[PDB]
């Protein structure tokens with residue numbers, strides 16, 4: 248019951264996906280598949296709203312972070328009431 | 329009759345263009361290579377990559393319904 | 402081994418004159434978020450619920466209705482006033498969940514000890530076609 | 545003068561000059577050869 | 587008499603339409619003195635209408651039952667000047683424009699910043715390439731024969 | 740204190756800025772990469788608050804744009820009186 | 823003795839990546855990462871910008887095709 252945020256191995260290591268998140272879904276974890284020695288991860292997709300700001304800042308040829316809209320809750324529908 | 333039949337042909341060709349474009353770009357395009365993972369009907373892919381409103385094949389059907397109505401009219 | 406800082410209920414609140422954008426019934430039947438920071442100087446900031454408040458010197462506690470409001474306020478505090486901030490989630494049962502820095506370090510910068518969730522060891526175009534996942538609960542991106 | 549000629553080479557100014565010349569040519573042709581429905585020269 | 591259409595020079599309804607046009611113009615003319623500028627303009631309009639109707643009659647156009655000329659585009663040699671000859675002229679001019687544009691785009695293709703040559707047109711090269719479209723059919727046919735018209739990507 | 744405060748010759752009259760489209764801002768003066776730039780060039784043309792952060796230049800541009808508008812209005816009035 | 827892997831820098835390469843904006847396009851190699859753990863070492867720069875206004879990308883060896 249949350250939007251599905253997936254990280255692929257084409258991630259360069261730029262933290263812009265994490266800095267562009269308004270609900271603290273993504274974080275940076277260590278890795279070894281790129282020069283930056285880090286990759287993004289989505290452990291808190293239960294708070295994901297689906298704004299897709301994270302994949303609006305991904306600089307690869309296609310998005311290494313992908314948000315698939317899914318079952319919606321009160322915190323996934325952006326409801327303050 | 330000639331003019332209205334050519335307008336009819338225009339309507340048929342345009343509606344076919346919309347529907348065929350939706351059917352053939354349903355699985356993906358250069359803007360959204362993984363459209364098949366998002367199902368038939370989804371709203372958009374966000375404002376990134378310039379904007380992605382009406383990018384699904386369902387939206388192609390929705391746009392082509394107007395042209396079909398105009399042609400039958 | 403980073404331990405989460407405990408919530409202090411006796412923390413004073415910023416000087417605010419009241420707004421209609423605050424808490425609602427969702428704060429009672431469901432959860433509501435609480436952001437705590439430490440202002441080194443008594444200044445004035447802009448609330449995410451509309452209007453302006455006056456934070457007091459020392460520790461400050463503010464209750465909001467959404468996590469996005471807490472994160473937006475914290476980003477404003479960090480960028481404009483350079484204040485360390487932590488926010489929690491409070492349930493009607495009284496449970497408190499320490500939310501934002503899960504290891505004490507900001508998520509933008511790398512920190513050891515974090516586990517990968519939602520990591521796919523392939524390019525995005527190598528996803529399995531939907532016809533191969535039909536009549537099964539598994540989605541192409543979940544494989 | 546080079547900058548002014550570069551400005552004259554920009555898209556709207558050049559398009560305006562070209563389309564004004566074309567419109568003037570078409571208008572003069574329509575004055576001197578009015579009400580043309582067929583091509584009767586051959 | 588193709589498709590049951592009388593020629594415009596032997597059509598009673600064509601002359602009737604000319605009569606209505608001239609009658610309306612004379613009714614407008616009656617409001618002014620003959621030596622005035624509006625009267626001269628109306629008289630010039632009437633003379634233009636008479637010349638137009640005479641030319642339409644003498645051009646060989648086939649007039650329908652409503653008194654209006656009907657174009658035949660089936661390719662009949664009596665009516666090649668209605669569609670086929672203007673169509674050939676239009677195709678020549680459009681091929682000229684397209685060939686000149688394609689030549690200009692090809693010429694500025696291998697530059698440092700080609701887009702700067704699109705917002706700001708480089709006039710000497712464009713004027714050099716303007717007359718290259720005069721022989722556009724020959725150049726296009728040879729380029730198609732040498733396999734230079736298409737790009738195999 | 741209310742005097743005539745005027746600086747002499749702040750902007751050089753030249754056609755160099757005419758030859759370069761979109762000179763007013765930075766993200767646009769780099770040159771067109773796509774067609775959208777052209778539309779942007781007609782969208783930020785009179786947004787003086789985004790070109791510079793100084794109120795003085797913005798106010799001067801506003802004053803001269805008002806003068807140009809008044810000139811256009813006077814030209815239109817002259818046209819109506821002539822016609 | 824270990825030779826550098828990947829194409830020489832400055833050479834032209836085809837992409838052959840179905841999800842890429844430059845799938846059939848040709849780019850120029852600007853750098854190749856010699857770390858064997860790097861999954862996409864071949865840095866390619868293209869003349870045209872994509873929909874994200876980015877003209878550079880990283881590709882792997884199998885998604886690289888030399889041209890003459």
Ligand code: CLA
Nearest residue numbers: 741742743798801802803804805806807808809810812813
């Ligand atoms: C009593 C003299 C006076 C007059 C007549 C005006 C009149 C005007 N001012 Mg104001 N203004 C004044 C004093 C004056 N101002 C002072 C002292 C200041 C500084 C505190 C300002 C600050 C100011 C600003 C910042 C702006 C204006 C604008 C305008 C115009 C807007 C109204 C409109 O267009 O109606 C139509 C009115 C007319 C056409 C009627 C005739 C008025 C004549 C043409 C004006 C000559 C007046 C001028 C002050 C004296 C000449 C100076 C000398 C060296 C030649 C108008 C021309 C706005 C504008 O449009 O600027 C271009 C604008 O942006 N004014």
Ligand SMILES: CC1=C(/C=C/C(C)=C/C=C/C(C)=C\C=C\C=C(C)\C=C\C=C(C)\C=C\C2=C(C)CCCC2(C)C)C(C)(C)CCC1
Nearest residue numbers: 659660661669670680681682683684685688722726727735
């Ligand atoms: C006789 C006639 C007719 C008919 C016709 C027809 C039927 C036709 C067809 C046609 C066709 C069926 C065609 C096809 C084609 C194909 C293709 C394939 C094409 C291509 C093209 C191109 C390639 C071009 C190019 C170019 C040029 C050259 C120039 C300009 C630019 C460009 C680049 C565009 C009618 C009856 C109507 C009328 C009378 C006459």
Ligand code: SF4
Nearest residue numbers: 258260261264305312
């Ligand atoms: S997910 Fe996007 S922002 Fe994050 S490292 Fe990968 S490419 Fe960079």
Ligand code: SF4
Nearest residue numbers: 268295297298299301
């Ligand atoms: S869609 Fe929005 S909330 Fe969800 S991970 Fe991306 S940036 Fe964060």
